[PDB]
Design a protein around this ligand. Sequence first.
Ligand code: CLA
Ligand code: CLA
Ligand code: CLA
Ligand code: CLA
Ligand code: CLA
Ligand code: CLA
Ligand SMILES: CC1=C(C/C=C(\C)CCC[C@H](C)CCC[C@H](C)CCCC(C)C)C(=O)c2ccccc2C1=O
Ligand SMILES: CC1=C(C/C=C(\C)CCC[C@H](C)CCC[C@H](C)CCCC(C)C)C(=O)c2ccccc2C1=O
Lengths: 743, 157, 88, 30, 42, 143, 73, 80
Amino acid sequence: PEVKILVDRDPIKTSFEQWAKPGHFSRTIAKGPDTTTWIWNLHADAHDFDSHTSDLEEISRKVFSAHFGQLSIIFLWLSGMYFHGARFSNYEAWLNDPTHIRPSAQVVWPIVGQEILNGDVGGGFRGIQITSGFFQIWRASGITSELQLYCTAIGALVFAALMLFAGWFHYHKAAPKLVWFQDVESMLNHHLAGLLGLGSLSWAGHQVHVSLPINQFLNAGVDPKEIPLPHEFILNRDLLAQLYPSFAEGATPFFTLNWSKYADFLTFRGGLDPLTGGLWLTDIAHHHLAIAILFLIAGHMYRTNWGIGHGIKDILEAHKGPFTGQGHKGLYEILTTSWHAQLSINLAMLGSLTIIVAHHMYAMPPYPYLATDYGTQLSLFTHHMWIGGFLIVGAAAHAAIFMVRDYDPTTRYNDLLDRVLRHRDAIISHLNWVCIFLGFHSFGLYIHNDTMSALGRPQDMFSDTAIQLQPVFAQWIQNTHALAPGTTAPGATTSTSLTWGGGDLVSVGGKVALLPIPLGTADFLVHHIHAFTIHVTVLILLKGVLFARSSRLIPDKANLGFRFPCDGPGRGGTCQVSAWDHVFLGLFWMYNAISVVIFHFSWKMQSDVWGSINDQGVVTHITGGNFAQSSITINGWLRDFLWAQASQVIQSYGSSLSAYGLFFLGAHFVWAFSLMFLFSGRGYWQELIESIVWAHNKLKVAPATQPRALSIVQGRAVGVTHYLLGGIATTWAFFLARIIAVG
Amino acid sequence: YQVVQPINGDPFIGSLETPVTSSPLVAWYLSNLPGYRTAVNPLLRGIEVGLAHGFLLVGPFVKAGPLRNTEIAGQAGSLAAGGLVVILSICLTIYGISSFNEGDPSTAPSLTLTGRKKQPDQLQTADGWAKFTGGFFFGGISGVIWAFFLLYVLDLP
Amino acid sequence: VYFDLEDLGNTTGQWDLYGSDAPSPYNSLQSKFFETFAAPFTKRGLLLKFLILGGGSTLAYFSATASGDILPIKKGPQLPPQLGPRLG
Amino acid sequence: NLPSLFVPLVGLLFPAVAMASLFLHVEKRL
Amino acid sequence: MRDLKTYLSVAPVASTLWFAALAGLLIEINRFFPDALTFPFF
Amino acid sequence: GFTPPELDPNTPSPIFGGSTGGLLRKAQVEEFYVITWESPKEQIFEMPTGGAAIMREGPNLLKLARKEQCLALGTRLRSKYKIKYQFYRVFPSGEVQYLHPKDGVYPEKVNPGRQGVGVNFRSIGKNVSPIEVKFTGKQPYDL
Amino acid sequence: MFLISWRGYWQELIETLAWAHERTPLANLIRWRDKPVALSIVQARLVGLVHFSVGYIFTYAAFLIASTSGKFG
Amino acid sequence: SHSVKIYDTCIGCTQCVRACPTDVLEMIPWGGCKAKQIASAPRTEDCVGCKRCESACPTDFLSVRVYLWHETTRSMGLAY
Ligand code: CLA
Ligand code: CLA
Ligand code: CLA
Ligand code: CLA
Ligand code: CLA
Ligand code: CLA
Ligand SMILES: CC1=C(C/C=C(\C)CCC[C@H](C)CCC[C@H](C)CCCC(C)C)C(=O)c2ccccc2C1=O
Ligand SMILES: CC1=C(C/C=C(\C)CCC[C@H](C)CCC[C@H](C)CCCC(C)C)C(=O)c2ccccc2C1=O
């Protein structure tokens, strides 16, 4: 009842003896291989901790150390990034001419002619243009010299060492206890106020002391070497007052509540700074301060050891109505017992958050000169979209895993979940009908438009010029956003984003940064396509989750496990009934959704936003506003998008972009390679390996580890893995080549 | 207190009772639709269903068809609605031919939600469905004619 | 009871959920109007022949007597013919 | 003029009669 | 120690060391003798 | 000699709110099944069709749509709890057919009153080639 | 779809659709005379192969003739 | 319904009867093997064809054989 620190000493000895024993964690795998299937199982069950043991404490300690190892690897990755920015980059040249220099941080060795990939990136540098956007981040933070990036890389290496050591420590030495992990109130309190609150406050402290002044000097055109060091703004406050006058007071308005003085460097002007194209740094610092205060407050909701505060158990149990019975009672016991339930929730939320990040970073460019680096923006958007989609599919997978393994109404019951299970049929049937209706009333419109345009009837299509389907709701919403500053937002000087407010076109260095985005029949059709694809993905995954235990076809499916091939050719055929195969198909459908999403983004930005601006204000977009007429047709998507914009990747040979031309075809290859696995079954392959084994045994060269074709589940896993890799890498090469050439 | 209850008190019958399923407004309204008037000559119930659907079908065909903007003949697009009624009257006809035989009795339930015995709806009989198809066709073509009969003083003609 | 080996219609839920069983709300005269004018259409075999043949002849009439002002296929090409890549 | 009679007779009337007759035979019982 | 050497003899680690040594050798061969479509020494 | 217990209607059924996985028109016009068991106390058990139900103390009767649902529930009644169970088939006429345990002994335990059905007295690889049964209604395994 | 996705998924989906039809008013007056089931495993391989082959032949025939007759040379 | 056959290579381990999910297999007394028992399939009308019994047979080759035959409502696993 009293939250406190609880660990055990030396639970597991540090020795290499278990290193030399493959499959030590599993009791069936530890005997060594009789056939080759063993080799695969060792990797498939490598991280399935709750199948290695049933003790929740061992599982929690393993998970803790795995988190520490992941943090070590992420810190090592960041160390590499900052070190490459310091040692093999042209960041100092990009800092003087950000509008002409191409950001590059990788230089290849000259061995087999690959030095052609070291292309002219400007600033007297031959390298590979980077789209990660680290240059924009390092500029926004105020970094100028390579020495600061060196020191950041060294600090990241030290932190990777710290994380690795802590991972060893909290498993082999002082390893925490189960109740320690289960102190959810204390943990949420420290993550809201200690982690997020103090983190936002620390970053706001950096931004008001380094980012704002150094970036003022960078905007003014001062040479970065002639710019004062950041710590010189912490000693002589005259330097800070000459840029932001309120720093001459000295925390006095903060304590006396004269905060109106701080409006010089803590503003609410919104929009974009027209010199850099990013959000006003004063606004971002003010934002981080507000976020810090909000999270520092929110980290006090949950009781711990001093009576005051909430207990999540009471809050859950108190929320029950006439439709859901005694709902929420029992959820606190579920979410404090099952790791997979927490993982499902957090994967869903983190993936949706990544998607929200992808939208918010394009519509509100946070870093200077990011909005005009079209390659960096496109790459960031697409990457975050893929991350979010994958994480949501994983949420589905782990929800199904919890259903199969941690669900038991006789011990940890919940009324809401039981009620959901008692009408899974209605839920799935209704989602099925919604998916059919959306498939007809989105893609069927595209087929209608294709058939009308082919028959010489352009007025019988669904177009901005013919049968119009205007997204009136979204148009009215963005209009209400445009008129909000000065009315329903008096403190706001301009619009929340530039895509709202009419007019106010921001351009940087001859290229546009942002302008009001049109919304027409094409946008309507594409948004309905997105809704439909999301719905079908949700249908697949949720239907897999709800029917994980039982169904009219197999009433004992839970006994077969979470990951099993089938249950025989009987009942007409029972292939792909496990929840694992539902995740397997949801992978394909998440791909099919996210691909259309990112293609929509690419064509929209290249047609109605991105382009070149004249001296007199004439903006010509990368494609001549062809989105309204061409994207309302499948043939238009085939011709005016793929066939036209793949030119750069099919012409990149003999230039620094030829690596993208190679990856294009290689990803085509692996994508088609997956089709061998997805279209076939392991019986034929085993019968082939039989004759091959005959051939080997004829020459006294057959292995003891008897070769065996991949398992059915492994066949599907390899198939979907290669399919996803091929498709995503093809789109990656295509996007990068196109946007780096025409950007 | 709870709102969702098993279907007629039996939890092992695959359904539930909800405000959408079991509610006085829904129960009365469905009990007063011609398809659920289990004691009325199916010819008349077909007339009503045919009149309602034939009347409704004219709108979409006229306002969305190919001749929609050629006002010289677009109002005659009710022919398409009438043709669909013909096609649907075939679908209705061929359905009963395969479902019910001449001498077969009714396949409708002969019970009530309260357990008492009941006379089965004659719609699930060969001759009953034949009267419903004939009624749906007669009301169908009549609904299309009556809908096309009106044309003016409407905001979407 | 809910399980009774005698009446399995009540045991397996073979009920009429929304059947009214009430007398006819359709007044007389009106019903006789429809029962005499929709009478020949209630022979499913005869209706099937009447629908197929009548509908097919109706379709054949409006297709054989089509107009160029309504269908571009009957109006034919109004422009002089084009010239192929090499041939006519 | 002949296409205006035979094209609907094979694309509308013929599949209608064919699908309806095959439906009756497939669903028939003995 | 003996357990550490037994780990280094496992299939992936032996494969990496063997293929790394092989990759480095072929790189130096194509570094001192680049291109070469033929066997020129006859 | 064994005598199968007759199905006693009006036997209590477990406490359950209802689910969508229950009976359909197949139970009305085709067939359905009924499993019975004794049980010591009131417990919770997972339903092979939906969520959870409260197993009543004393005799229990549960009607399902498929035979496999009955044996699956019975196997769990015999594993998690320690409960004997029988189940029958019910035609729409009202007739009842006893199914399992047929002999009153469980089928995995040898019982002397059982006769061989479909037992071929040879190695599986000693079946004949399909040509030797061609144009006959036979199969190489029916013999 | 017929070659990647396999049967058991579609059988359970059809079961959830059969329940939907039996519990929907008005429509439940229409009864199917053949029980809806998912396509057989061998039938799925055949249907997927036929779609694959038809798309194969028709896609290439369209490109072949249009790219050649468009130039006629 | 599906056909199920038992061959005399059976050793009498009663594993096909334990794995069967519709109670099709039985264990009858026999004199051929050591356990004094062989399998039989007297209720193939309830057989669904899952071949869960073949997955559990230790005989090489199998002693249970499930030959998928004419589909019925019971063999298709329909609850509707
Ligand atoms: C692009 C797709 C693709 C590819 C590449 C293949 C490739 C192959 N198929 Mg296959 N197939 C496909 C699609 C494909 N198939 C589809 C859609 C179907 C319908 C289901 C089939 C059905 C099928 C059948 C039924 C059979 C094959 C067979 C084969 C093999 C023939 C042997 C050979 O030619 O030597 C090798 C050819 C290659 C292309 C191998 C390329 C990969 C090399 C080795 C890369 C080198 C590795 C390199 C270090 C990369 C590092 C990777 C790193 C991550 C470790 C071959 C590997 C036959 C077979 O097994 O042969 C005995 C066989 O019977 N296929
Ligand atoms: C297998 C040979 C064959 C094929 C592929 C076609 C194909 C076509 N014919 Mg044609 N036709 C054929 C033989 C064929 N015909 C013969 C032998 C005659 C009599 C000399 C005609 C007389 C004819 C006329 C007058 C017209 C067409 C037209 C057409 C086109 C429209 C479709 C149609 O109206 O259906 C075909 C209609 C028919 C009356 C032909 C069916 C009668 C012959 C004897 C075939 C026997 C059918 C039998 C009952 C079932 C056959 C079994 C199976 C092989 C299908 C179409 C491209 C129309 C057109 O020009 O489109 C613009 C049209 O006006 N056809
Ligand atoms: C292969 C044969 C075939 C033929 C001959 C036609 C012919 C026709 N189609 Mg159709 N279509 C076909 C196949 C065919 N279609 C297929 C396979 C599809 C699915 C992709 C479609 C989908 C389709 C759509 C979505 C539409 C058409 C429309 C039309 C009509 C447009 C021309 C017009 O304006 O006339 C005149 C226009 C009228 C409205 C007059 C209607 C003609 C009378 C009422 C016919 C009477 C029907 C008769 C009583 C019973 C017929 C069935 C009977 C044989 C059992 C035309 C008569 C358009 C249409 O029908 O307009 C609403 C249209 O909307 N078709
Ligand atoms: C203000 C206190 C505080 C802070 C800052 C953190 C911070 C963190 N926790 Mg943590 N936690 C806390 C209190 C705190 N926790 C309490 C009271 C409990 C319940 C007893 C938990 C239980 C808990 C669990 C079960 C897990 C975490 C995890 C994490 C990491 C999440 C990954 C991440 O966000 O990457 C961001 C990276 C950074 C912000 C870098 C800063 C990291 C600094 C150096 C750590 C300093 C905070 C630490 C608690 C101080 C003690 C260390 C000291 C003795 C040397 C993160 C670094 C996860 C994890 O283990 O990740 C490895 C995880 O599994 N926490
Ligand atoms: C924080 C996120 C997270 C975490 C902690 C877990 C954790 C776990 N998952 Mg899970 N999952 C996640 C996200 C996550 N997952 C997401 C986002 C998805 C959607 C794709 C899934 C889908 C998923 C499935 C379908 C399954 C799991 C399973 C598991 C368990 C076993 C993992 C294992 O040992 O596999 C071993 C890891 C490997 C064998 C590596 C495979 C190689 C990958 C797939 C391809 C590499 C490509 C690479 C990215 C780029 C190419 C480089 C190459 C050329 C060299 C484990 C507890 C399995 C389970 O049994 O559940 C209990 C299970 O089957 N997960
Ligand atoms: C291009 C290939 C393709 C197509 C067309 C589809 C189509 C569909 N999939 Mg599928 N899928 C595919 C590939 C494809 N998939 C692959 C490769 C996989 C393996 C990963 C899957 C896995 C998968 C799963 C797991 C599921 C689906 C589902 C669905 C259905 C969603 C409901 C819907 O949209 O209704 C609308 C129908 C369409 C969009 C198809 C086009 C319809 C046209 C526009 C209308 C034309 C009508 C016309 C009048 C025809 C008459 C002509 C006549 C003469 C014959 C849909 C029919 C889901 C489902 O079952 O539905 C809920 C579902 O669960 N798919
Ligand atoms: C091709 C294929 C196989 C065969 C695929 C196999 C056997 C993959 C294994 C091939 C690798 C290359 C064997 C591993 C070789 C070792 C790494 C040793 C090599 C020695 C050095 C070169 C490293 C299946 O097993 C299968 C199963 C189910 C559905 C579809 C399919 C399927 O399509
Ligand atoms: C969608 C899908 C289904 C569901 C498909 C079904 C139930 C078929 C539905 C067909 C409807 C009736 C429309 C078919 C329209 C045809 C064009 C009509 C042709 C009929 C004659 C011309 C032959 C499966 O059953 C299946 C089974 C195994 C692997 C993959 C799948 C699979 O992908």
